[PDB]
Amino acid sequence: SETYDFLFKFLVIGNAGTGKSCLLHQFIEKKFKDDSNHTIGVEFGSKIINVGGKYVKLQIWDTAGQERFRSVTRSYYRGAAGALLVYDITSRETYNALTNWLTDARMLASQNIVIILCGNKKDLDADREVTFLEASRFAQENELMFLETSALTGENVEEAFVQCARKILNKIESGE
Numbered sequence: 001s002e003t004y005d006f007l008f009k010f011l012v013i014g015n016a017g018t019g020k021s022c023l024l025h026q027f028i029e030k031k032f033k034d035d036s037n038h039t040i041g042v043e044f045g046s047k048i049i050n051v052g053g054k055y056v057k058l059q060i061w062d063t064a065g066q067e068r069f070r071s072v073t074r075s076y077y078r079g080a081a082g083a084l085l086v087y088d089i090t091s092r093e094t095y096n097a098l099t100n101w102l103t104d105a106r107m108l109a110s111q112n113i114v115i116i117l118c119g120n121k122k123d124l125d126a127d128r129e130v131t132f133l134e135a136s137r138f139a140q141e142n143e144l145m146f147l148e149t150s151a152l153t154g155e156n157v158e159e160a161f162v163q164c165a166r167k168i169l170n171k172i173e174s175g176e
């Protein structure tokens with residue numbers, strides 16, 4: 001019965017272990033799933049959101065982060081309008097991988113894809129390995145909006161997905 005005015009394909013991308021699957025599950029179900037294991041292929045969720053009285057259906061591909069699946073994950077960029085690019089604030093390696101993820105999206109996605117950078121596991125701040133300020137500098141240098149999120153608590157998860165959609169809606173309306 002429920003309709004929508006817009007349909008967008010999104011990805012969730014980033015190194016294994018960063019919390020991609022937990023982020024999608026939090027956005028859709030509003031709970032932390034704590035038995036989550038490695039995605040061995042691709043998972044899907046969808047949700048309709050209300051953006052200013054416009055209903056936007058998000059079709060979201062939660063991709064495998066393990067290196068062994070990289071050629072598979074790369075096949076998903078085509079047709080994606082938006083992506084959440086995720087690292088783990090407690091794992092510097094996952095943050096150091098970000099340049100490679102952005103190189104992939106530059107080569108394989110639409111030049112107009114909207115990417116939101118998510119520093120996840122913010123609830124694990126006592127084990128932080130990446131500063132807010134330093135990630136903020138990187139995002140700015142890369143023309144990306146940046147949020148710290150927690151799949152566990154929900155902090156900024158709805159905001160990340162909604163803002164990706166709002167930025168795509170803005171492109172549709174005006175400019176580039």
Ligand SMILES: Nc1nc2c(ncn2[C@@H]2O[C@H](COP(=O)(O)OP(=O)(O)NP(=O)(O)O)[C@@H](O)[C@H]2O)c(=O)[nH]1
Binds near residue numbers: 017033
């Ligand atoms: N404390 C905390 N743990 C989290 C958070 N998000 C994910 N985790 C935990 O981190 C681990 C990896 O999460 P998961 O969502 O499976 O990661 P993934 O990015 O989907 N991995 P893959 O790419 O291999 O599928 C799990 O043990 C999960 O419970 C978070 O915000 N806070």
Ligand SMILES: [Mg+2]
Binds near residue numbers: 020037063065
């Ligand atoms: Mg996963």
